[PDB]
Design a protein around this ligand. Sequence first.
Ligand SMILES: [Mg+2]
Ligand SMILES: [Mg+2]
Ligand SMILES: [Xe]
Ligand SMILES: [Xe]
Lengths: 118, 118
Amino acid sequence: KKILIVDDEKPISDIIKFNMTKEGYEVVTAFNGREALEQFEAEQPDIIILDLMLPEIDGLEVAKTIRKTSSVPILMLSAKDSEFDKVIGLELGADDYVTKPFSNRELQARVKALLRRS
Amino acid sequence: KKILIVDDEKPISDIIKFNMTKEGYEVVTAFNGREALEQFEAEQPDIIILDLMLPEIDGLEVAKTIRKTSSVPILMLSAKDSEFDKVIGLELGADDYVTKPFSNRELQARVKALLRRS
Ligand SMILES: [Mg+2]
Ligand SMILES: [Mg+2]
Ligand SMILES: [Xe]
Ligand SMILES: [Xe]
């Protein structure tokens, strides 16, 4: 399976990439909203882990435009952990919303749960 | 022309109703998100003035669901006046975003501007 990780922090992106690779996923990466959209169209990932906060396009905006054409599962990841953040991510199309810092094992479990249902 | 005013404060709703009536619009009112959606389907207004903050459904959620079926112009009205509020209202489908308190004459000008282009 192919995962697109859209994250503007190279350290966090690498931790997720390393852990998804170890689980046997193919990983493509993007570091802003524009790259996320390009990688999305070109690579057709099975799932996208999307930071809400990105340099070019926000995460909310990326997920909005994705949902125009695609039902690809989106797992939103963010340091913002209030009700309003989670609810607005889910309502703008996230299938799930996990907060940072996260548990590596939980992330993996949640990715598998999204792919199981999809 | 018919305006639906979705506002949970009966005092503000009345001021907008009074002023739109004086301009020759037919007015229907709604005081929460559920009533907005019901009035929307039943009355088919030409334009909707929508408070962002409502008891049942938020304004963002109402405008989201409206846009599923309809291109009816939406003018979002709110006490929240930050960039993030305006931008997220516009991006969730508002044609315009005016802040409270507002100028009666400006509201009217902006309503006419939305109807002119529509
Ligand atoms: Mg990345
Ligand atoms: Mg009202
Ligand atoms: Xe957005
Ligand atoms: Xe929303």
